[PDB]
Ligand SMILES: Cc1ncc(COP(=O)(O)O)c(CNC[C@H]2O[C@H](O[C@H]3[C@@H](O)[C@H](O[C@@H]4[C@@H](O)[C@H](N)C[C@H](N)[C@H]4O[C@H]4O[C@H](CN)[C@@H](O)[C@H](O)[C@H]4N)O[C@@H]3CO)[C@H](N)[C@@H](O)[C@@H]2O)c1O
């Protein structure tokens with residue numbers, strides 16, 4: 001047991017990481033030779049498909065030395081910056097090595113630029129300790145962060161002294177929050193005169209060429225990552241020159257590493273067209289129509305939140321949830337267990353037909369659960385918490401909100 | 410000026426980044442078609458040479474999906490962890506995406522494990538704001554870090570209350586600090602009962618197969634990066650299970666990206682032989698004996714600190730330092746300006762012969778500086794501070810130390 005970290009990855013019945021020896025398009029092969037259709041896709045960072053040939057060629061060329069050097073600037077630096085600025089807007093752009101690094105740098109830059117101490121947060125922003133939970137819910141943690149769990153009532157209370165608040169930083173979820181929720185968030189932040197940071201590490205570049213919340217939030221600062229490089233190790237921040245002036249202090253040794261620049265330039269060129277996002281939505285929607293019908297035909301109490309871009313199974317019980325993923329594993333459908341499923345643009349007709357047949361076999365395996373009590377709100381809240389680390393949107397008062405926080409924290 | 414960051418990189422006389430189109434071994438091509446011999450080598454992270462064929466082959470292959478997937482575990486994960494453990498020791502290992510990320514995670518883990526608030530630091534640890542300077546010497550910054558600038562007197566002062574100290578965190582320099590300096594540091598930390606973290610992001614794996622301070626410091630926790638992947642986007646931490654237990658909270662989306670694992674596994678295989686490190690030392694030593702002679706023959710007051718693994722020009726005046734790099738720029742010798750020069754294993758006879766020839770021409774160009782006053786200690790201190798962000802070792806009393814800090818901060 002040499003590894004000190006605990007990486008999120010597909011794990012087997014003994015909680016050991018599944019070992020994958022090969023991948024192409026939508027398909028994985030594991031160490032036993034078992035073949036899987038991938039809905040996890042490095043938690044949605046594989047937008048194009050595994051071993052995408054154009055990205056792979058670009059990386060190959062860059063590995064030889066013929067497309068830039070790690071020692072310094074290249075034309076691919078300008079190309080990537082230009083593309084991000086065109087897609088996502090803002091005045092300036094910075095590049096980082098993980099979503100975690102990017103969101104931390106972004107929010108600290110805003111704290112410095114505004115001179116205000118608190119960050120009000122909803123959703124996951126990466127592994128850094130600055131996001132660890134406070135000792136007392138709804139109080140600042142040691143790094144001045146207060147999590148409001150996507151509850152706008154709580155947010156209103158936290159905005160009551162806006163001079164204390166550097167930014168509101170929110171990781172969107174388009175399965176569990178409506179457009180109106182976003183517009184209200186934007187309204188509240190504008191009224192309070194506080195900066196809005198959209199942490200689009202997951203959703204950026206995937207629902208559209210640009211930011212999912214470009215219009216809904218018009219954020220002052222954005223962060224993207226998973227959509228920009230077909231899995232390669234890069235992230236980005238952009239927004240106003242003034243709010244991001246503190247990023248002038250950022251430099252790191254691997255900045256000019258040419259394979260990541262080549263992958264990002266290639267992937268971003270494809271992203272800019274809108275085609276992979278359309279392909280994903282359409283493929284995912286087809287799979288969903290089939291899956292919803294299969295669950296209904298089998299009288300299985302499993303709803304599906306979301307849409308083809310990202311969806312999530314919502315089973316009525318934890319036992320059923322475990323059985324669902326067990327059956328999926330038996331059929332070679334690799335789902336990101338409990339979380340959101342993000343197909344890639346490699347989900348062609350052949351992949352879809354096979355995923356459909358496999359899912360019908362999943363529903364057969366689930367026959368013991370036929371006719372169970374339908375999904376209720378406690379299940380909806382528990383399942384949504386697993387993907388968003390806070391509360392799905394639905395009517396609540398403070399009693400209900402605080403009850404759910406006590407339950408789900 | 411879309412870029413919000415200010416990356417360290419080769420820059421021209423107007424402070425514009427030099428744009429490099431391609432590289433091969435020790436050589437670079439710029440956008441003008443000018444051909445350079447590289448002593449910068451992505452600040453010492455290109456140990457093997459640009460476009461190393463064996464690493465390139467492994468990277469190209471991994472990009473196709475033939476060696477596993479970014480979705481989860483592959484046997485190359487085990488191979489990289491096992492190689493690092495064999496080379497560097499400790500009980501556990503973690504992987505990160507930059508040196509900055511690794512050192513931050515390491516020291517926060519130690520602070521959590523020990524329950525103590527302060528970090529005592531010497532040297533550079535990356536770009537994160539946690540390392541920004543305090544208001545005054547000997548005062549903690551906002552993140553509990555106190556800089557001792559490599560001065561063991563200042564360290565003893567800070568260790569008067571060691572119950573406050575989670576760790577001492579040191580970035581070695583083997584040009585400006587002797588073996589005995591390290592052994593004293595180790596001694597002081599052990600007596601005080603404080604954890605010692607060796608930040609070997611720069612020096613790890615380059616002086617020897619493993620840590621440069623394996624015996625000198627026997628650190629509780631180590632960090633490496635530049636040596637491990639021929640420039641690719643990975644770093645590592647290792648050491649005691651107890652002190653690094655808090656790393657269980659680390660996960661990041663690109664963890665399984667197979668090209669980086671491929672580069673690390675290939676580079677580490679070569680590092681484990683000791684061959685590239687020896688080649689570097691021997692090639693740089695040959696260059697240095699030629700350069701020292703050339704400087705002496707021209708009566709130029711420029712010393713050279715260090716050795717073939719890493720060396721540094723120490724000119725008697727700033728005006729001469731500027732002229733030296735300007736002249737090297739004309740002859741196409743790319744030095745990391747002001748800092749340390751780190752040749753790669755691609756510095757062969759052909760390259761050395763040409764670098765020697767080119768350096769002779771640099772000496773011809775600096776005639777207007779012949780016969781100048783020889784290097785003094787003020788120059789030695791100023792130049793060393795540029796590479797270590799603290800004080801070179803030399804006899805000092807407390808008053809001299811205080812004055813030097815006033816001058817150089
Ligand atoms: C908006 C945003 N911003 C920034 C980042 C960071 O980018 P990165 O640095 O490139 O990875 C991400 C990275 N995203 C990775 C995933 O992040 C979440 O996943 C998180 C978290 O929700 C999820 O937490 C688990 C929870 O849902 C389960 N119900 C309980 C489990 N113990 C817990 O585990 C995690 O937190 C534990 C507590 N500290 C920790 O011990 C576990 O090891 C850790 N896995 O674990 C993931 C990280 O490990 C999302 N739900 C997912 O859709 C997403 O794909 C991001 O989505």
Ligand SMILES: Cc1ncc(COP(=O)(O)O)c(CNC[C@H]2O[C@H](O[C@H]3[C@@H](O)[C@H](O[C@@H]4[C@@H](O)[C@H](N)C[C@H](N)[C@H]4O[C@H]4O[C@H](CN)[C@@H](O)[C@H](O)[C@H]4N)O[C@@H]3CO)[C@H](N)[C@@H](O)[C@@H]2O)c1O
Nearest residue numbers: 251252253417452507508509533534535580610611795796
């Ligand atoms: C031990 C160790 N630990 C961790 C890391 C982090 O690894 P990474 O995240 O992978 O890069 C490194 C990364 N190393 C990069 C370089 O780190 C230093 O270089 C630093 C710093 O010393 C150097 O500082 C400059 C100073 O030497 C000059 N005399 C004055 C200049 N303004 C200043 O510039 C830097 O610091 C400024 C302080 N605010 C900042 O404004 C500048 O923008 C910044 N470039 O700049 C570099 C980083 O930007 C070393 N001198 C070098 O040998 C080395 O190769 C490391 O060496």
